[PDB]
Design a protein around this ligand. Structure first.
Ligand code: BCB
Ligand code: BCB
Ligand code: BCB
Ligand SMILES: C/C=C1/c2cc3[nH]c4c(c3C)C(=O)[C@H](C(=O)OC)c4c3nc(cc4[nH]c(cc(n2)[C@@H]1C)c(C(C)=O)c4C)[C@@H](C)[C@@H]3CCC(=O)OC/C=C(/C)CCC[C@H](C)CCC[C@H](C)CCCC(C)C
Ligand SMILES: C/C=C1/c2cc3[nH]c4c(c3C)C(=O)[C@H](C(=O)OC)c4c3nc(cc4[nH]c(cc(n2)[C@@H]1C)c(C(C)=O)c4C)[C@@H](C)[C@@H]3CCC(=O)OC/C=C(\C)CCC[C@H](C)CCC[C@H](C)CCCC(C)C
Ligand SMILES: CC(C)=CCC/C(C)=C/CC/C(C)=C/CC/C(C)=C/CC/C(C)=C/CC/C(C)=C/CC/C(C)=C/CC1=C(C)C(=O)c2ccccc2C1=O
Ligand code: HEC
Ligand code: HEC
Ligand code: HEC
Ligand code: HEC
Ligand SMILES: CC(C)=CCC/C(C)=C/C=C/C(C)=C/C=C/C(C)=C/C=C\C=C(C)\C=C\C=C(/C)CC/C=C(/C)CCCC(C)C
Ligand SMILES: CCCCCCCCCCCC[N+](C)(C)[O-]
Ligand SMILES: CCCCCCCCCCCC[N+](C)(C)[O-]
Ligand SMILES: CCCCCCCCCCCC[N+](C)(C)[O-]
Ligand SMILES: [Fe+3]
Lengths: 323, 332, 273, 258
C-alpha cells in the first residue's frame, strides 16, 4: 500500500514562502507556526493571515449580527447563565409571528431579526469582496468568488428575496440551532411537500453528485500519487503518466473520461448547481406554485398507491359536521 | 441514551411507504400495567323500589335510578375520583344533600359532562366511552391537565423543579419544548387550538397555483401558522404515544381519502370534542373552584388529548365500562 | 478507438479471476470476469423491472413503483407480484454493484495504480446494504426496505423520517448532513482554486503551487495543500454515509421515540433541570 | 385567478422545468464533454488513412484550442497533435480489436504497461522564483526533517525478496510545497545511485521496506542526467519503473490472484 496517501511519513520543514500580491502585502499579520500532528494529514504551517479592509468590515458586521442574536437568545432565558447553556440549541431569534406584510415589524416581534439579517448580509458581501479581490491581487481567476456568489444568492433567497416576493417577512429563516431546522419543516409543510419540488430534486441530485465526484476525484488522485498526480497544475500544462492512468481508469470503467483540468470544471459546475437549482426552486415557491404535490398531480407526475386501511373521507365535508 | 431491541412495528399504509407504529415493548408493558389498575365493574344490583327522585332530596342528574343502582354509582364515583379521601370528599357527614363542599357541585357538572361525552361524541369515543376514571385515575385532580400557559411536569403528581415552576421565567422554553415532544417550536398548541374554536388547524393550500387575492402581503396567513400546526401535531403524537404515519401518509399531509387512515378522522372528531369540553364544561368551572386550583390567569385546569389518552392510542388500551354503568351514557 | 496515449497501457494481466479468458476490451470498456457478471446482473435486474412494471398500473416513469412485501411476510420470500420482484431485483442490484467494484480493482491493477477508487465505491454499496438489508434484518421484515421508483422512494424517505416526528434532530443525520454540505463546499473551493490558477484570464501567465497556498493562507489563514485536499475530499464525502449509517440503523432497532426527545440526555441532567 | 397561470393549461414553473433541462444538457454536452477532449484526441484507429480530409465528427467533438502562457516562458496549446513516437516493445496477442498487448522484452526497462511513462518535457520543474523545485537535501540546506520523524539517511532499503539492496543517502524535497517526494539510495554492489518515490517506501525506524521490485531490479532504475536536479520526464520514468514492478516484478504478479 501507498502509506503516503494515508499520512505523511517523514515531514519536511523549511523557510516560509510568501507570494507577493499587487497590494496588501503589509496587511498579512501574525507569525507562522508549525503543528506536527496537523503536518501528518496536511500542511504543517498555520498562518499568517491577510487582514484587509473587507475582512475587517466582515468581522465588524458579523459580530454585530452575532451579538444581536446572542442578546435576544439570553433574553429568552431571562439572562440566567446556566439555563442559557442548557437550552442553547432551543433558543432563537424569530422573524415576525404576526402578519405585518412587508411593513417593518416591531422590535419585539421580528425587528431584531430583520436587524440581524441586515448585518449578516453586509458581512457576507464584505467577505465576498475579500474572496474576489484576494484572487486578483494574486493574479488568479475569480472562479471561487462566482461559486461563493451563488451560495450567498441562495441565502438571500430564503432570507429576504422570497419573503419580499410573497410580501411577508414572517417567512424568513429564524436564527438558532434547532429553530433554523424547524423552519425547514414549516416551509415544506406550507408549500405542499418539498420532495415534489423539481428544483429540490435538482439541488439534491447535484449535492449527491458532489459527494460522488469528490469521492471519485479524491480517490483517483490518491491512486496516482506515486506518479505525482497531486501536482495538478503542471499535469494540466504537461500531461504526465499520472493523469494518463487516471483518464484511462475512468474511460475503461464508464466508457468516457475527463481531463485533469476538466474534472475540476465538472466539480465546480456541480457545486454551483446545488445553489443555482435551490434558488430557482425558492424563487418559484409561493410566487408561482402554492402546493408542490398538487402541482405534480396537475401535471400527472405524482405516484399513487392502493389503500391499506380504509380510505377516509374528510369528516369536515360530511353533512351536518361541525366546523 | 438508547433503547435495546427488538422493536414492535405495525403497518398503516401500502407496503413500501414506511407507515406504521414503532413501539418499545418495555414501554408498552409499563403503560399496560399502569392502565390495568382500572377498577373492575361493581357487581350489578337489582332495580328495586321507587326512583331516587322520590327518595332523596337533592338528586338532579341521576334521578331515574333506584336506590341500590344510585348507591352503586356513588361507590364507583368514589373509587374513580377520591378513593383515598372517601365519600366525605364531596359530602357533609351529617347531611348528604348539602352542596356546601365544592367537589359536590363540580361532580354534578362532571356527571353531565361525562354523559355528554358518551352521548354526543360517539364519533370519537364509540362504544368504548369514558368514565370518571379515564381522566381522574383515582385522584380528584387528574394527573394530566393544562393551563393557559405550559406547566411542568406534565404529570402533576410529580414535584416540580425550581426551573420547572411556572413562575421561573428562565424555564419557559423547556416547559414549552416538553409539551411539543422536545421540539424547539415556539408555539403553545393548547391555547392556540384546543382551548377554543377560534383558530383553523389546516394551513396547506388546496390548489397547485397560488390563488390571486389570498396570496400576497397581508392577505397571507403568516408562516407561523404552519409552525403552530406542526407543534400541535408533535404534541398530539406524543400524547397518544405514536408518530405521524399513524394518521397521515406524509406524501400529502393535507389529503384525505387514501392518504389518511380512519384514525385521522377519529382524531379530527377528538379536536372538536376537546373544544366542546373546555369551552362548555371545564373552563366555566373557575367560578366553582378554590383559588388554589386556578392558574395564574384565574383559569380552571382544562383537558387535552393526554388527559384521556396518557400516551396510549386508545385510552386504557380500549378498556370499557359502558355496559356496566348505563347511567353514564349514552342517554336516550 | 484509442486515445493518442492509450496503446502503451493496454497490456495483459491484472485480473483477479480467469486470467486471459476475459482480459480484453470492447470499445473503450474493459471487460474482465466482473464485466461479465455485471452485465449478467444488469440484464437480469432490468428484465425483472420490466416484467414487474408491465403487471402494474402505469408506464409513466415518474409513477412506476416496485415495492417490498407487507411486513407480515417477515424475512421470507413473498409472492412475485406483492414483494417477490422487489426481492429478486434487490439481489441483482447487489450483484451488479459488487461486480462493478471488483471490475474496478482489476482495472486498477492493470494500470499499476492504487485501489482507492473501488475502496471509495464500497461506501455507497455499504449504505445501500444498511437501508435494504441490515436495518430490515434488525427489524424482522423486508417490508421496512425502500421501494424502487423515481418518486415513490421519496415517499418512503418522507414517511420514514416522520415516523420519528422530526428526523432533523437525529444526531447521525446531523452529522451526515454536515458532511454533505461541507463536501459540496470543498469541491467548489478545490475546483475553483485549480481553475483559478490555470486560467487567470487576459493572457496572464498560469500561476503556481505556491500561489495556491498563498491564496488560502491569505483568506482563511491556512492551506491544507495539494495532496491533502484530495485525501480530505475522500474523507469528507465518505463520512456522509459512514456517519449517516448510524443514524439510520439506530432508528427503530435502538430508538423508538421521536428524535427531539433523544436530546433529553442533555436537557434533563438534574444539575440544571 | 392564479399567479403563475398561462393560457391552455401552462404555468411558469412548467416552462422553467424545460428551460432547466435545456441549460443542463447544453453545459454538459456542448461545453464540458468538449473540455474533456483537450487530451488524447483525435483518437487512433486501425490506421486513419484519409490524409486528404478529416472525418466530420472529429472536428465537431473538439473545442477551440486554448493557449496556456507558462510562468517561466513558453506556451502550450491544447488540444494539439502529439503522436507517441517511441517504438513500443509489445505484440498483439490476437487479431481482435481490443485484445491486450504482450511485452516482448523486459517490460520494466522497455517502459510498457504499468511501467509506461508519459513524454513530458525534458525540463526541470521550477519554484515561483525560478529555482529547481525537486532537489536533494545536500542542495536544499535550509530544509530539514521535522523533529519527531525518522531520519532515513543511513537506513538500509529492503526489497520484496527480503534482501538488503542499498542505503538511503539523501531525501529529495519539493521546495514549493515543503514535502519530501523521493529518497535517494546507493544500490549496493553497483556503484550508482537510484531515486525512489516515497509512495513506494514503507518507512520503518530501522529500515525502508520496498515491496514493488526485487533487490536485483534496483540496478536498472532509470538514471538521471544530472546528480542534483530532475526533469519532469525523468520523474515520470523513475515513478513508472516501480509501478511496473507491481505487475511485472515476478511472473506470478501478472496472473490471477485466484
Ligand atoms: C435514504 C435516502 C435515499 C434517497 C433520497 C433521495 C432524495 C431526497 C432525492 C433523491 C433523488 C434521486 N435519487 Mg435517491 N436514489 C437513487 C436515485 C435517485 C435519482 C432518481 C435522483 C437523483 C440521484 C442523483 O443525481 O445522485 C447523484 C448521481 C449522479 C448525478 C450520477 C447520475 C445518476 C442518475 C441521474 C441516476 C438515474 C438512476 C435511474 C433513474 C434508475 C436506474 C434505472 C435502471 C433501469 C437502469 C438510487 C439509484 C438509489 C439507491 C440504489 O440506493 C437511491 C436511494 C436513496 N435516495 C435513498 C432511499 N434521492 C432526487 C430526485 O429528484 O428523485 C426524484 C431527490 O430529490
Ligand atoms: C421536511 C422538509 C425537508 C426539506 C426542506 C428544505 C427546504 C425548505 C429547502 C431545502 C433545500 C435543500 N434540501 Mg431539502 N433535502 C435534502 C437536500 C437539500 C439541499 C441539497 C437543498 C439545498 C440546501 C443547502 O445545500 O444548504 C446548505 C448551504 C447553505 C445554506 C448556504 C450557506 C452559504 C453562506 C454563505 C454561509 C455563510 C454563513 C456565515 C459564515 C455564518 C454567519 C452567521 C452569523 C452571522 C449568524 C436531502 C438530501 C433530503 C432528503 C434525503 O430527504 C432533503 C429533504 C427535505 N428538505 C425535506 C423534504 N430543503 C433548499 C432547496 O434546494 O429548495 C429548493 C431549500 O430551500
Ligand atoms: C421528512 C424526512 C427527512 C429526511 C429523511 C431521511 C432518512 C430516513 C434517511 C435520510 C438520510 C440522509 N439525509 Mg435526510 N436530509 C438531508 C440529507 C441526507 C443525506 C446526507 C443522508 C444520506 C442519504 C442516503 O442515505 O443516500 C443513499 C444513497 C445510496 C445508497 C446510493 C447508492 C448508489 C449505488 C451504490 C449505485 C447505484 C447505481 C445505479 C442504479 C446505476 C444507474 C446509473 C446509470 C447512470 C447507468 C438534507 C441535506 C436535508 C435537509 C436540507 O433538510 C434532509 C432532510 C430529511 N431527511 C427530512 C427531515 N434522510 C439517510 C441517513 O443517513 O440518515 C442518518 C437516511 O437513512
Ligand atoms: C454548494 C456551495 C456550498 C458553499 C460554497 C462556498 N462557501 C464559501 C465559499 C464557497 C465557494 C468561499 O469562498 C467562502 C470561504 O471563505 O471559504 C474558505 C465560503 C464560506 N462558507 C462558509 C460557511 C458555510 N458554507 C456553507 C455552504 C455552502 N457553501 C454550500 C454547501 C454552509 C452551510 C452548509 O450552512 C456554511 C456554514 C464560511 C467558511 C465562508 C464564509 C465566511 C463569511 O462569510 O464571513 C462571515 C463573518 C464572520 C465574522 C463569521 C466568522 C466565523 C466563520 C466560520 C469564518 C471564520 C474564518 C476565519 C479566517 C477563522 C480564522 C482561523 C485562523 C485563526 C486559523
Ligand atoms: C459518499 C459516497 C458517494 C458515492 C461514491 C461513488 N459512487 C461511485 C463511485 C464512487 C467512489 C464509482 O467508482 C462509481 C462510478 O463508476 O462512477 C462513475 C460510482 C457510481 N455511482 C453511481 C450512482 C450513485 N452514486 C450515488 C452516491 C454516492 N456515491 C455517494 C454520494 C447515488 C446517490 C443516490 O446518491 C447514485 C445514483 C453510478 C453512476 C456508479 C455505479 C455504477 C454501477 O453500479 O454499475 C452497475 C449497475 C448498473 C449499470 C445498473 C444496475 C441496475 C440494477 C441491476 C437494477 C436497478 C435496481 C435499483 C436499486 C433501482 C433503483 C430505482 C431508484 C429510482 C431508487
Ligand atoms: C455490451 C457489453 C457486453 C459490454 C461489455 C463491457 C462492459 C462491462 C460494459 C459496461 C456497460 C455499462 C454498464 C456502462 C455504464 C457506464 C456508467 C455506469 C456510466 C455512469 C456515468 C456517470 C453518470 C458518472 C457520474 C459522474 C460524472 C458526472 C462524471 C463526469 C466526469 C468524469 C468522466 C469523471 C471521472 C474522472 C475523475 C473522477 C477524475 O478524478 C479524473 C482525473 C483525471 C483525468 C480524468 C478523470 C476522470 O475521468
Ligand atoms: C364527588 C365525586 C362525590 C363522591 C366521592 C360521593 N358523592 Fe354522593 N353525590 C355527589 C353528587 C354530585 C350528588 C348529587 C347527585 C345528582 O344526581 O344531583 C350526590 C348524591 C348523593 C346521595 C343522594 C343524597 C340526597 O340528595 O339526599 C347520596 C345518598 C350519596 N350521594 C351518597 C354517597 C356515598 C355513600 C358516597 C361514598 C360511597 C358518595 N355519595 C360519594 C357527589 C359525590
Ligand atoms: C376528562 C374529560 C374528565 C372526566 C371524564 C371527568 N373529569 Fe372530573 N375533572 C376533570 C378536570 C380537567 C378537572 C379540573 C381539575 C380539578 O381538580 O378541578 C376536574 C375536576 C373534578 C372535581 C373537582 C376536584 C377538585 O378540584 O379537587 C371533581 C369532584 C370531579 N372532577 C369529579 C368527576 C366525576 C365524579 C366524574 C365522572 C362522573 C368526572 N369528574 C369525570 C376532568 C374530567
Ligand atoms: C392522529 C391521532 C394524527 C397524528 C399522529 C398526526 N396528525 Fe396531523 N392531522 C390530524 C388531523 C385530524 C388533522 C386535521 C386537523 C383539522 O382540524 O382539520 C391534521 C392536520 C395536519 C396538517 C395540516 C394539513 C392541512 O390540511 O393543512 C399537517 C401539516 C399535519 N397534520 C402534519 C402532521 C405531522 C408532521 C405529524 C407527526 C408529527 C402529524 N400530523 C401527526 C391527525 C393526526
Ligand atoms: C376522553 C374524553 C378523550 C379525550 C379528551 C380524547 N380522546 Fe381520543 N379516544 C377516547 C376514547 C374513549 C377512544 C376510544 C378507544 C376505542 O377503543 O375506540 C378514543 C380513540 C381515539 C383514537 C382512535 C385510535 C384507534 O386506535 O383507533 C384516536 C386517533 C384518538 N382518540 C385521538 C385523540 C386526539 C388527537 C385527541 C385530542 C384532540 C383525543 N383523542 C382526545 C377518549 C378521548
Ligand atoms: C431593508 C431592510 C430593513 C430589510 C432587508 C434586510 C435583509 C437583507 C435581511 C436578510 C436576512 C437574511 C439573509 C436572513 C437569513 C437568515 C438565515 C438563513 C439564518 C440561518 C441560520 C442561522 C443560524 C444557524 C444561526 C445560529 C445562531 C447562533 C448559533 C448564535 C450565533 C453564534 C455563533 C457562534 C454563530 C455560529 C454559526 C455556525 C458557524 C455554528
Ligand atoms: C455590500 C458590501 C459593502 C462593504 C463595504 C466595505 C468593503 C470595503 C472594500 C474595500 C476594497 C478595496 N480594494 C478594492 C482595494 O480591495
Ligand atoms: C423531485 C420532483 C420531480 C418531479 C418531476 C415532475 C415534473 C413534471 C413536469 C411535467 C412536464 C409537462 N408535461 C406536459 C409533460 O406534463
Ligand atoms: C439531477 C442532476 C442531473 C445531472 C446530470 C449529469 C449527468 C452526466 C451525463 C454524462 C453524459 C456522458 N456522455 C458521454 C453521454 O456525454
Ligand atoms: Fe484536484
Amino acid at each position: 500500500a501507498d502509506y503516503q496517501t494515508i499520512y505523511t511519513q517523514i515531514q519536511a520543514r523549511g523557510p516560509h514562502i510568501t507570494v507577493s500580491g499587487e497590494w496588501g502585502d503589509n496587511d498579512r499579520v501574525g507569525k507562522p507556526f508549525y503543528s506536527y500532528w496537523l503536518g501528518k494529514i496536511g500542511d504543517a504551517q498555520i498562518g499568517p493571515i491577510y487582514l484587509g479592509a473587507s475582512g475587517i468590515a466582515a468581522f465588524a458586521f458579523g459580530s454585530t449580527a452575532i451579538l444581536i442574536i446572542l442578546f435576544n437568545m439570553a433574553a429568552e432565558v431571562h439572562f440566567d447563565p446556566l439555563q442559557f447553556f442548557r437550552q442553547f440549541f432551543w433558543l432563537g431569534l424569530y422573524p415576525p409571528k404576526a402578519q405585518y406584510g412587508m411593513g417593518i415589524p416591531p422590535l419585539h416581534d421580528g425587528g431584531w431579526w430583520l436587524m440581524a439579517g441586515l448585518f449578516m448580509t453586509l458581512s457576507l458581501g464584505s467577505w465576498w469582496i475579500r474572496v474576489y479581490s484576494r484572487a486578483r491581487a494574486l493574479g488568479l481567476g475569480t472562479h471561487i468568488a462566482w461559486n461563493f456568489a451563488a451560495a450567498i444568492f441562495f441565502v438571500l433567497c430564503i432570507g429576504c428575496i422570497h419573503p419580499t416576493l410573497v410580501g411577508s417577512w414572517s417567512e424568513g429563516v429564524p436564527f438558532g440551532i434547532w429553530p433554523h431546522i424547524d423552519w425547514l419543516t414549516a416551509f415544506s409543510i406550507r408549500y405542499g411537500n418539498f420532495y415534489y419540488c423539481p428544483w429540490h430534486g435538482f439541488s439534491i441530485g447535484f449535492a449527491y453528485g458532489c459527494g460522488l465526484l469528490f469521492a471519485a476525484h479524491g480517490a483517483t488522485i490518491l491512486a496516482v500519487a506515486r506518479f505525482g498526480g497531486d501536482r495538478e497544475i503542471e499535469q494540466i500544462t504537461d500531461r504526465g503518466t499520472a493523469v494518463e492512468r487516471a483518464a484511462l481508469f475512468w474511460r475503461w470503467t464508464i466508457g468516457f473520461n475527463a481531463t485533469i483540468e476538466s474534472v475540476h470544471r465538472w466539480g465546480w459546475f456541480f457545486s454551483l448547481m446545488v445553489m443555482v437549482s435551490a434558488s430557482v426552486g425558492i424563487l418559484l415557491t409561493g410566487t408561482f406554485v402554492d402546493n408542490w404535490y398538487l402541482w405534480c398531480v396537475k401535471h400527472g407526475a405524482a405516484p399513487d398507491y392502493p389503500a391499506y386501511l380504509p380510505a377516509t373521507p374528510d369528516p369536515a365535508s360530511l353533512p351536518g359536521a361541525p366546523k | 441514551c438508547f433503547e435495546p431491541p427488538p422493536a414492535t412495528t405495525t403497518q398503516t399504509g401500502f407496503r413500501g411507504l414506511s407507515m406504521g407504529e414503532v413501539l418499545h415493548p418495555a414501554t408498552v408493558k409499563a403503560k399496560k400495567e399502569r392502565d390495568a389498575q382500572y377498577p373492575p365493574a361493581l357487581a350489578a344490583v337489582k332495580a328495586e323500589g321507587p326512583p331516587v327522585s322520590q327518595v332523596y332530596k337533592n338528586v338532579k342528574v341521576l334521578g331515574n335510578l333506584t336506590e341500590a343502582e344510585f348507591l352503586r354509582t356513588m361507590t364507583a364515583i368514589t373509587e374513580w375520583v377520591s378513593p383515598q379521601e372517601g365519600c366525605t370528599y364531596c359530602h357533609d357527614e351529617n347531611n348528604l344533600a348539602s352542596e356546601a363542599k365544592y367537589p359536590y357541585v363540580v361532580a354534578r357538572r362532571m356527571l353531565e359532562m361525562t354523559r355528554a361525552i358518551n352521548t354526543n361524541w360517539t364519533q370519537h369515543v364509540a362504544q368504548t366511552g369514558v368514565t370518571c376514571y379515564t381522566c381522574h385515575r383515582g385522584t380528584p385532580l387528574p394527573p394530566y391537565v393544562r393551563y393557559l400557559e405550559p406547566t411542568l411536569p406534565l404529570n402533576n403528581r410529580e414535584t416540580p423543579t425550581h426551573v420547572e415552576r411556572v413562575e421561573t421565567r428562565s424555564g419557559y422554553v423547556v416547559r414549552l419544548a416538553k409539551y411539543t415532544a422536545y421540539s424547539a417550536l415556539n408555539y403553545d398548541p393548547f391555547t392556540m387550538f384546543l382551548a377554543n374554536d377560534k383558530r383553523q388547524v389546516r394551513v396547506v393550500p388546496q390548489t397547485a397555483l397560488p390563488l390571486v387575492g389570498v396570496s400576497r402581503g397581508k392577505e397571507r396567513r403568516p408562516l407561523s401558522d404552519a409552525y403552530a400546526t406542526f407543534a400541535l401535531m408533535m404534541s398530539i403524537s406524543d400524547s397518544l404515544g405514536t408518530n405521524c404515519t399513524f394518521c397521515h401518509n406524509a406524501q400529502t399531509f393535507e389529503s384525505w381519502g387514501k392518504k389518511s387512515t380512519p384514525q385521522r378522522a377519529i382524531a379530527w372528531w377528538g379536536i372538536r370534542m376537546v373544544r366542546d369540553l373546555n369551552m362548555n364544561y371545564l373552563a366555566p368551572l373557575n367560578a366553582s373552584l378554590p383559588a388554589s386550583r386556578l392558574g395564574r390567569q384565574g383559569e380552571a385546569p382544562q383537558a387535552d388529548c393526554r388527559t384521556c389518552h396518557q400516551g396510549v392510542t386508545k385510552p386504557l388500551f380500549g378498556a370499557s365500562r359502558l355496559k356496566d354503568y348505563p347511567e353514564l351514557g349514552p342517554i336516550k | 478507438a484509442l486515445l493518442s496515449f492509450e496503446r502503451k497501457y493496454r497490456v495483459r494481466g491484472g485480473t483477479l479471476i480467469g486470467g486471459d479468458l476475459f482480459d480484453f476490451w470492447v470499445g473503450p470498456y474493459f471487460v474482465g470476469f466482473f464485466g461479465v457478471s455485471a452485465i449478467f446482473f444488469i440484464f437480469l435486474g432490468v428484465s425483472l423491472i420490466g416484467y414487474a412494471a408491465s403487471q402494474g398500473p402505469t408506464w409513466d416513469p415518474f409513477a412506476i413503483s416496485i415495492n417490498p412485501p407487507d411486513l407480515k411476510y417477515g424475512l421470507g420470500a413473498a409472492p412475485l407480484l406483492e414483494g417477490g420482484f422487489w426481492q429478486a431485483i434487490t439481489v441483482c442490484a447487489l450483484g451488479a454493484f459488487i461486480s462493478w467494484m471488483l471490475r474496478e480493482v482489476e482495472i486498477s491493477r492493470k494500470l499499476g495504480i492504487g485501489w482507492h477508487v473501488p475502496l471509495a465505491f464500497c461506501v455507497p454499496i455499504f449504505m445501500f446494504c444498511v437501508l435494504q438489508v441490515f436495518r430490515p434484518l434488525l427489524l424482522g421484515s423486508w417490508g421496512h426496505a425502500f421501494p424502487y421508483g423515481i418518486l415513490s422512494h421519496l415517499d418512503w424517505v418522507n414517511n420514514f423520517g416522520y415516523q420519528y416526528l422530526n428526523w432533523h434532530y437525529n444526531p447521525g443525520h446531523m452529522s451526515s448532513v454536515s458532511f454533505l454540505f461541507v463536501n459540496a463546499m470543498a469541491l467548489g473551493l478545490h475546483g475553483g482554486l485549480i481553475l483559478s490558477v490555470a486560467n487567470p484570464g487576459d493572457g496572464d501567465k498560469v500561476k503556481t503551487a505556491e500561489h495556491e497556498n498563498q491564496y488560502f493562507r491569505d483568506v482563511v489563514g491556512y492551506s491544507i495543500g495539494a495532496l491533502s485536499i484530495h485525501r480530505l475530499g475522500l474523507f469528507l464525502a465518505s463520512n456522509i454515509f459512514l456517519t449517516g449509517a448510524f443514524g439510520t440503523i439506530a432508528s427503530g432497532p435502538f430508538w423508538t421515540r421521536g428524535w427531539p426527545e433523544w436530546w433529553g440526555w442533555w436537557l434533563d441532567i438534574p444539575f440544571w433541570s | 385567478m392564479y399567479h403563475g397561470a398561462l393560457a391552455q393549461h401552462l404555468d411558469i414553473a412548467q416552462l422553467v422545468w424545460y428551460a432547466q433541462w435545456l441549460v443542463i444538457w447544453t453545459v454538459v454536452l456542448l461545453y464540458l464533454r468538449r473540455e474533456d477532449r483537450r487530451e488524447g484526441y483525435p483518437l487512433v484507429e486501425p490506421l486513419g488513412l484519409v490524409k486528404l480530409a478529416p472525418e466530420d465528427g472529429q472536428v465537431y467533438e473538439l473545442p477551440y484550442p486554448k493557449t496556456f502562457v507558462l510562468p517561466h516562458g513558453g506556451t502550450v496549446t491544447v488540444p494539439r497533435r502529439r503522436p507517441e513516437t517511441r517504438e513500443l516493445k509489445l505484440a498483439q496477442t490476437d487479431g481482435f480489436e481490443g485484445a491486450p498487448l504482450q511485452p516482448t522484452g523486459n517490460p520494466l526497462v522497455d517502459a510498457v504497461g504499468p511501467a509506461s511513462y508519459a513524454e513530458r518535457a525534458e525540463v526541470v520543474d521550477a519554484t515561483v522564483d525560478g529555482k529547481a523545485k525537486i532537489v536533494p537535501l545536500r542542495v536544499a540546506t535550509d530544509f530539514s526533517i521535522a523533529e519527531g520523524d525518522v531520519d532515513p539517511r543511513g537506513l538500509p532499503v529492503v526489497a520484496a525478496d527480503g534482501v538488503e539492496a542499498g542505503t538511503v543517502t539523501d531525501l529529495w524535497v519539493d521546495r514549493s510545497e515543503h514535502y519530501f517526494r523521493y529518497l535517494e539510495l546507493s544500490v549496493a554492489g553497483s556503484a550508482r545511485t537510484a531515486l525512489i518515490p516515497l509512495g513506494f517506501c514503507d518507512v520503518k525506524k530501522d529500515k525502508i521496506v520496498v515491496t514493488s521490485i526485487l533487490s536485483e531490479q534496483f540496478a536498472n532504475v532509470p538514471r538521471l542526467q544530472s546528480r542534483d536536479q530532475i526533469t519532469l520526464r525523468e520523474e515520470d520514468k523513475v515513478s513508472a519503473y516501480y509501478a511496473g514492478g507491481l505487475l511485472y516484478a515476478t511472473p506470478e504478479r501478472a496472473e490471477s490472484l485466484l
